[PDB]
Amino acid sequence: GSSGSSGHKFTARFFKQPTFCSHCTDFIWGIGKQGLQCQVCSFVVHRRCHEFVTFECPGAGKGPQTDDPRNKHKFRL
Ligand SMILES: [Zn+2]
Ligand SMILES: [Zn+2]
Incomplete structure (x- = not known):
């Protein structure tokens, strides 16, 4: 097998729900x-x-790019 995934932390994981x-x-x-x-x-x-x-x-691999995923935070409970 070719060594070198160079991808995400993919790993078999049971999915009780329809992924x-x-x-x-x-x-x-x-x-x-x-x-x-x-x-x-x-x-x-x-x-x-x-x-x-x-x-x-x-x-x-790389960190958080210039862009920002987070958005307006909640106020109420
Ligand atoms: Zn990922
Ligand atoms: Zn697919």
Whole structure:
């Protein structure tokens, strides 16, 4: 096998709920148990989608880019 993932912290993890791949725009819970969720940007993508992934993890590797994900904070409970 070619050593060098250079990707996210993908790792097999049971999905009691119907996970939704935010890459190919397809379902996961049903067409098998191929679902790897990243422990950094909570980016879960099919087993094959993993390698396909091109985006650069915001946490894994590089830090927080100029842009900012956080938004207006809540006031009430
Ligand atoms: Zn996918
Ligand atoms: Zn990630």
